[PDB]
Ligand SMILES: *[C@@H]1O[C@H](CO)[C@@H](O[C@@H]2O[C@H](CO)[C@@H](O[C@@H]3O[C@H](CO[C@H]4O[C@H](CO)[C@@H](O)[C@H](O[C@H]5O[C@H](CO)[C@@H](O)[C@H](O)[C@@H]5O)[C@@H]4O)[C@@H](O)[C@H](O[C@H]4O[C@H](CO)[C@@H](O)[C@H](O)[C@@H]4O)[C@@H]3O)[C@H](O)[C@H]2NC(C)=O)[C@H](O)[C@H]1NC(C)=O
Ligand code: HEM
Ligand SMILES: *[C@@H]1O[C@H](CO)[C@@H](O[C@@H]2O[C@H](CO)[C@@H](O)[C@H](O)[C@H]2NC(C)=O)[C@H](O)[C@H]1NC(C)=O
Ligand SMILES: *[C@@H]1O[C@H](CO)[C@@H](O)[C@H](O)[C@H]1NC(C)=O
Ligand SMILES: *[C@@H]1O[C@H](CO)[C@@H](O)[C@H](O)[C@H]1NC(C)=O
Ligand SMILES: [Ca+2]
């Protein structure tokens with residue numbers, strides 16, 4: 056006796072037959088089940104939640120409550136002993152540019168966001184959580200182990216607030232706690248346009264019927280747009296430099312300014328919307344502002360889909376690409392398009408691809424000024440370095456000419472993220488994204504490593520020797536077993552990322568299976584998938600086949616030279632060609648119509 060009932064706060068829209076464009080919320084995509092893939096609903100559960108009390112309390116909440124007869128290890132102790140390293144020499148990916156990392160974060164932000172519970176401000180709560188490190192309600196602090204240097208320097212804990220959950224986000228109900236996905240499950244450019252009607256309207260220029268997105272009125276980049284500023288206070292981007300006082304950008308996704316290169320990629324995408332709207336207006340002078348905005352939005356969504364499925368996923372999944380994501384055969388309205396709770400952890404493989412520095416390069420691909428290269432941690436919520444230090448071109452040149460970090464069993468997550476993370480309202484460059492990922496796995500009720508191995512038809516190692524064989528690494532398996540005591544208790548984020556990479560890929564078997572299944576479902580379960588008959592025309596699909604990140608750069612910067620294959624390692628000048636050489640997006644098939 057089902058009860059798909061619950062989903063309380065409700066962006067409840069009824070669905071119009073033969074409606075020509077996506078909703079902003081993702082409602083009405085699936086005709087039979089219109090909430091499927093819509094924002095502000097529960098993450099899908101591919102397996103039942105696993106909580107200390109079967110309902111809502113994370114493993115690790117109650118010190119004396121074991122998981123399978125063993126205490127779960129402190130998130131920070133796993134971080135310190137397994138995830139950390141000192142030496143950045145030799146850690147770079149010799150065949151992935153920095154754009155490979157950056158596109159991952161972009162796609163991730165299109166697909167999923169499980170924000171911390173509201174509780175608001177004006178409350179003795181997250182203040183107390185930060186101050187006194189007392190576990191209670193939504194305060195689930197990351198406690199330092201006795202030997203942790205941060206115990207000496209930073210107090211007894213890293214504050215950590217539990218993720219929001221659907222129906223109530225205060226009291227609770229008699230099924231398990233289900234965390235919210237606040238963005239649309241569809242790969243639909245929700246990170247540009249918003250997943251909520253109010254934000255989507257606020258992002259638009261509704262003054263002119265030109266179908267444009269709002270742009271910064273305070274600063275321009277050699278005549279090219281910046282995103283608008285978010286004028287909400289306090290601003291973490293003002294906080295990190297109170298002399299410069301440059302606010303965060305406002306985008307479709309709340310996280311756009313988290314680091315300077317995310318903000319950079321957001322800037323490219325916004326510019327591309329306005330370039331498309333202007334061109335469609337020239338082609339189609341009688342199209343109104345709503346029509347121009349929707350047609351540009353639809354093209355930019357197809358661009359994101361094609362870059363992702365054609366260029367990115369093959370070099371993530373390598374040999375597993377054909378196993379999990381066969382050639383597209385059409386829309387299947389029986390496929391669940393919802394992002395799963397586990398996927399939101401599987402996609403954090405990107406955290407091990409983030410290198411320790413960011414470079415700005417000039418028109419000659421040489422160092423931009425006397426501090427061309429900067430430590431990553433100085434660039435969290437850093438917008439002033441864009442406006443006041445050369446705009447986005449030097450940063451885009453670095454995305455092309457510099458490399459991603461290569462995942463390494465001995466060098467997993469750079470100290471820029473593992474020790475120097477900045478979080479809004481928490482003042483210090485002193486947080487640990489790895490420990491946060493582990494604590495969040497437990498927050499979200501994640502089944503352990505072997506449950507997911509089973510889910511993926513893979514062996515479930517029970518002993519040291521079994522884990523050493525799966526990981527192909529004796530020392531890492533010994534460190535895992537000393538902390539976790541059974542592979543059944545290994546948190547999915549660390550167990551998935553501990554596996555050796557598949558041939559031609561950048562994730563191991565378990566991740567290839569969880570990522571592949573999810574990407575297959577968001578493609579096959581999307582009625583507005585670019586290649587679905589009647590979404591675009593035959594002639595439009597032919598034009599769309601020629602999109603490239605290189606053309607996106609040529610069209611929306613003053614960069615003269617780009618590589619043809621932007622995700623691989625490219626060196627200047629050898630691998631860089633003139634922009635005039637790069638295929639263009641031919642918009643002539645968007646002519647209203649012809650004869
Ligand atoms: C939404 O979309 C709209 C337009 O589609 C955007 O509105 C336009 O914004 C830009 C600013 O970013 C304005 O450009 C300025 O233009 C002046 C030159 O003014 C002349 O030409 C204008 C463009 O055709 C025209 O609009 C002007 O006409 C208005 O003003 C006169 C009074 O002068 C009035 O008589 C008319 O009736 C109109 O009301 C005029 O003919 C230019 O000098 C400005 O430069 C100064 O400021 C910039 C900083 O932005 C600085 O760099 C310069 O060096 C200099 O100090 C500036 O370029 C344009 O005027 C706006 N159009 C309208 C109709 O208002 C809007 O910005 C979008 N909003 C968002 C949030 O994205
Ligand atoms: C410098 C780069 C990056 C920074 C600073 C960063 C920071 C963060 C932070 C602070 C969180 C929230 C953690 C939590 O509270 O649980 C997060 C979540 C996440 N990150 Fe990263 N990250 C980066 C790069 C990447 C990359 C490259 C990928 C993927 C390829 C990625 C995928 C994700 C995903 C999926 C989440 C969870 C989103 C959700 O809530 O559903 N990130 N990241
Ligand atoms: C905050 O931003 C300001 C710029 O607004 C940075 O100051 C500039 O940086 C160096 C000073 O060593 C010089 O090139 C400029 O003369 C400075 N300008 C001003 C106005 O001071 C400053 O370094 C940033 N500070 C931090 C902590 O990031
Ligand atoms: C780099 O990777 C791409 C696939 O992403 C491939 O075409 C090329 O052979 C690789 N180059 C090297 C040097 O391995
Ligand atoms: C449609 O989806 C269902 C559920 O994934 C699946 O069982 C069925 O085989 C799919 N149809 C295809 C592949 O045509
Ligand atoms: Ca739903």
Ligand SMILES: [Ca+2]
Pocket residue numbers: 165166238239240241242243244245246
């Ligand atoms: Ca989306």
Ligand SMILES: [Ca+2]
Pocket residue numbers: 278279280326329
């Ligand atoms: Ca522009």
Ligand SMILES: [Ca+2]
Pocket residue numbers: 429433434437440
């Ligand atoms: Ca800096």
Ligand SMILES: [Ca+2]
Pocket residue numbers: 464465528530531
């Ligand atoms: Ca090792």
